[PDB]
Structure formats: structure tokens, C-alpha cells
Amino acid sequence: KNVLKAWLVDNTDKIFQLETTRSIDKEIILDRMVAKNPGVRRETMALGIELMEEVVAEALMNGESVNTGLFRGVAQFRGVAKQNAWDAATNSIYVSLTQGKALREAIKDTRVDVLGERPTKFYIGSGQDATTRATDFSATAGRNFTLFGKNLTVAGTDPSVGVTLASAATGTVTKIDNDMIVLNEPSRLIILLPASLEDGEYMLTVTTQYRGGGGALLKTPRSTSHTIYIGGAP
Amino acid sequence: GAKNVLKAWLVDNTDKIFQLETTRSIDKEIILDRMVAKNPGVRRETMALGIELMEEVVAEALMNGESVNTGLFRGVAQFRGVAKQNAWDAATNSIYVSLTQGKALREAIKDTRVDVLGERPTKFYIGSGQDATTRATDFSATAGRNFTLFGKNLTVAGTDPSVGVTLASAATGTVTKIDNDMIVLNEPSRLIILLPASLEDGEYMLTVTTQYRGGGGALLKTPRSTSHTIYIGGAPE
Numbered sequence: 001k002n003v004l005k006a007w008l009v010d011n012t013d014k015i016f017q018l019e020t021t022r023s024i025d026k027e028i029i030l031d032r033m034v035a036k037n038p039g040v041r042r043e044t045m046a047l048g049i050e051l052m053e054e055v056v057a058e059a060l061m062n063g064e065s066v067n068t069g070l071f072r073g074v075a076q077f078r079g080v081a082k083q084n085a086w087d088a089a090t091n092s093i094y095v096s097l098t099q100g101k102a103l104r105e106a107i108k109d110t111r112v113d114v115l116g117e118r119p120t121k122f123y124i125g126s127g128q129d130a131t132t133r134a135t136d137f138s139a140t141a142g143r144n145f146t147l148f149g150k151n152l153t154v155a156g157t158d159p160s161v162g163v164t165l166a167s168a169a170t171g172t173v174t175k176i177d178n179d180m181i182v183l184n185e186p187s188r189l190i191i192l193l194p195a196s197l198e199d200g201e202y203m204l205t206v207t208t209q210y211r212g213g214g215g216a217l218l219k220t221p222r223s224t225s226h227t228i229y230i231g232g233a234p
Numbered sequence: 235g236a237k238n239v240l241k242a243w244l245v246d247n248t249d250k251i252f253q254l255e256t257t258r259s260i261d262k263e264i265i266l267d268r269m270v271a272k273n274p275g276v277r278r279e280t281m282a283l284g285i286e287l288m289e290e291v292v293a294e295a296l297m298n299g300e301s302v303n304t305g306l307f308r309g310v311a312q313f314r315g316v317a318k319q320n321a322w323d324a325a326t327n328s329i330y331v332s333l334t335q336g337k338a339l340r341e342a343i344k345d346t347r348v349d350v351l352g353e354r355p356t357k358f359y360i361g362s363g364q365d366a367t368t369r370a371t372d373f374s375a376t377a378g379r380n381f382t383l384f385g386k387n388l389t390v391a392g393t394d395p396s397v398g399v400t401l402a403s404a405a406t407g408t409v410t411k412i413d414n415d416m417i418v419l420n421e422p423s424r425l426i427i428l429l430p431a432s433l434e435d436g437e438y439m440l441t442v443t444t445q446y447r448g449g450g451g452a453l454l455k456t457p458r459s460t461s462h463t464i465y466i467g468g469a470p471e
Contacts, residue, residue: 002297004311004329006322014317016327018310022300029304032291033284040284048269048276048284053305055268057342061238063257065463067404067437068265069289071307071333072465074372077252077348081244086348091252093240093343096372097307097333101435104468106293107329112313112322136310136332168303199337201303227301229308232340 002110008117009125010150017125019115020227023168023201060095069102078132092234094132121212124149124204124226131234137204137226142195142233144182147206149224151186154178156209158221163191165228166203174202186210195233204228236347244353245361246386253361255351256463259404259437296331305338328470330368357448360440360462361385367470373462378431378469380418383442385460387422390414392445394457399427401464404437422446431469440464 005019024032026049034042056073059066065074079091127137130144139145154162163176176191183190189206205225209217241255260268262285270278292309295302301310315327335343363373366380375381390398399412412427419426425442441461445454 002294004297004299006313008317008320011316014320015315016313016317016322018299018313023303024295024300025303026305029288029291029295029302032295033287036291037283037287040280040287044276044280045284045287047273048281049288049304051269051273051276051281052265052285053338055265055272056306057338058238059260059265059268060339061240061342061346063240063254065256065259065437065465066265067259067261067465068285069262070292070309072374072437073306073335074256074463074465075240075254076372077242077254080247081250081252084244084250084350084352086242086252086350091348093346093348095335095339095343096370096374097335098368098370098372098374098465098467099331099333101468102289102293103296103309103331104435106297107331108471110297110311110329112327112329114317114320114322116320132334134332134334136312136334138308138332138334199340201301201308227310229301229303229310229334231308231335232337 002106003113004110005113005115007115009123016112016114020225023227025169025200067100069100071097071100071103073097122151122222123224124152124206127226127228138229138231139193140234141193141197141230143193145191145193145228147189147191147204147226148187151210151212152189152206152208152224153186153210154181154184154189154206154208156217156221158209160207160221161209162207163189164205164207165194165197165230166205167198168201168203169198193230197230197232199230199232202228202230236345238342238346240346240348241351242348243351245359251362252348252350259463261405261437303336305336307336307339308334324471357386358388358458359385359460360388360442363462363464374465374467375429376470377429377433377466379429381427381429383425383427383440383462384423387446387448388425388442388444388460389422389446390417390420390425390442390444392453392457394445396443396457397445398443399425400441400443401433401438401466402441403434404439405434429466433466433469435468436466438464438466
């Protein structure tokens, strides 16, 4: 019933990479809930989701493990316990989440549509968040994020050249200052993510005139993207 | 000050780490009861229907390759294993959903203080854990697969028939004893176990019962027990 579209990318080994499609938030979830069951009042459903989030946040922050159909969560601690004390600069709380029974059951009814390899050797293969060590394209605002790929060097004179973040919620495009691209290699980019960015999903785009391998710069810039979740600055 | 409090122990990792003192485990039934308790304006049956409806929409969105964000989490489908002959192989490749905390949890973390209790009173406890399949260290585990327990004086030893590793279901209270031969590594600071495949998804209380005495010494006349909560995810396909 369900279909996941996947690219073949270099790991070296070949690995599957989910195709860039869509991001959905609470507003779209509420629209789809009302479309599936027109007997539910949107305002009641919106209230219910906020209420449930309050209950779960409070449970996790008061040391309970929480299990829903979608996930299981528990509060965790990050950083070394320096001098048998909590240091707000090195230590932090986070909630570790694992897929729940409803997701494991939905996976059973899902097939993978292999798209093959991308037609051009220009893409974002993988990523890593410095702070959380996550590789699922979740990231931390005001901290470093590494992009691994092919022919990613930010180069050229054209004004569109550079790294951008486009908000899935508002559509607003934030350009990353070129000084904040602290490593600019064809197979790897290290960027500092702006601290002011609101939590949510963004479209990360590398636009460059850098030609694959050696040679002259491309006359017109080319773009490659990947979805990314940015969690607010710690 | 901070409206939430987390209690944490200082356990061994040459250096020390923080270990949450877990309060209890809650499911959809308790969540729904607490929602009604906070807002008597809502009808519990309407809230229960809404949660099933929200889960269906989120599960369909994820399984059709969309990234999903709520205030509690962001999710996206991910793939495991190498591409053999540039084609999906159901016997070596798998799908999972990677989940990260959302904005509501990040804001709640801001109103939370950590109350350090110091070091654990006894030198017999479960400090940390690791799932072999996912490599998760949050005490989430995979049924039919290996799990590692790190701690102090965890060696399973003694003549008493109660000695061993058990899992008690939070949903029913049903206890599953792991066969002693499914204890693959039996060291004081680390146990490697094979989890049975038939375990239903959910939270369990994992208990290590043993007559093994701290460091050097004769076996204890009476067995002692130490526990840790564990989430078990259903066996892989």
C-alpha cells in the first residue's frame, strides 16, 4: 500500500536515500484528519493535540518513559559529569525517541521504489549534526552541520551561489553567510547554522558554479537539495 | 524557577555520566486520563478517536516518504543495509523511522532542572544498555536480537532457580524468563543477552537476579535483584 521512493548514493558501497518530496506539520496533519473523518471538529482536534503534547512533555520532564502507538520516549543526559556536578554549558537534557508499534506495523505494508542513481554526480549524500551526532538530517541551530556529497564546493560569481534554508512553514528563504561555510570541499561542507532560525523543517540548498572535478566554472549555477529539521538553539 | 525536575545518579561510563532515575512508564490510556484531568472540557472518547486518527495520518505520511513534524517530534523514513545489485533486498534491507525531539520538548527542557543525587548507594545496578540492531543507548531494544547491559556485579551465578534475567510486561505484568543459555556474555560490568522473538512491543521491567557477590567472595545464600526499564520493539521481518 505505501511507497517510499529511493535514490542509489555512494556510502565504497551503494546505499538507499529517500527522495526529497514533502514536509507536513500540525496544520496539514489537522487538514488530513478532518478529510479522513469529517465528523470531527478541527478546533476540538487542534485543542486535543496541544493538550496531549503538554501531558507527554510534562511526563518526560518528570522522569517517565512515554509509550504511544507512534513512539516511545525517555529523557536522556548529554555530556560528561564534570567534578560530580551539572554544568549548563557542557551538559544538556534531551528526549530520545524510538519508533512505536504503529510505525513498525505500517512499515510491513510499505514497498521501496528504487529510482536508481541520480543522473548527475552532484548531490547531498548524507549529513551529521555536530551537537547531537544525528545523521537523519535533524540539526541544531547555532551549531555546526556537515554535508557529505558530490561536487558540493560553493564557487562562482553569480548572486544565487551559496547555501540557503527555506522554511516549510512560511516559505522564507534564509541565506547562510559565506563566512559561515567553514569547510568548502567537493565531498564535504561544514556550515554554522543560524541561531535565530525557528524550529521546523527547511529545504537546504547548495547552489554553485563549481564544475564536477577539474576545469572552468559553470556558466549557469546548478542546485541540489535535501530536507532538514532544525531544532532551536540550546 | 524550573517547573520540572529530573533526578539523576552518577554512574561509571575512567569518567562519570548521568543516569536518569525513571519515575514510571505511561501509555495512551494514562495520557488520555491526564488530558481529561487537565481539561474537564474535553470528552475522553473524542480525544481517544483523535489520537487514533492523528497516528493513522502520521503513519501514512511517513510511509509515503514525507517528513513529519509535530510539537513532540520530527520523523522521517530511513533505510538500513547496502544496495546489493542496485535493488532492494527484503532479506538484507529494512525501513525504520528516525525520530528527533520537537519544539514542545525543547521548550519543556528549558523549564527543567536536574537534581543530582550523587553516586548510586549500592555497587549492584544496571548503569546503561545498548541495542545491537539499532545501536540505541536509551534502553530501547529489538525482540529476537541482542542487548547489552552495562553496570556493576551483574554476573548471573548461583544454584537458586530464581537466578537469571526476566522481563515483566508493563501492560499485563506477565514475566518472561530468558533462558540462561541466551546469556552470551556473563561479566560483572557487562551482560550480553539474546532477547526472545515472541515479545510483544512495549515497555518492560528488566531484572537481573543473582547470588554473585561484589568482587571476590563466596556466593550469596539469598539471591539479590536489580532492575531497569526497557522498551522492546517487535522482532525484525
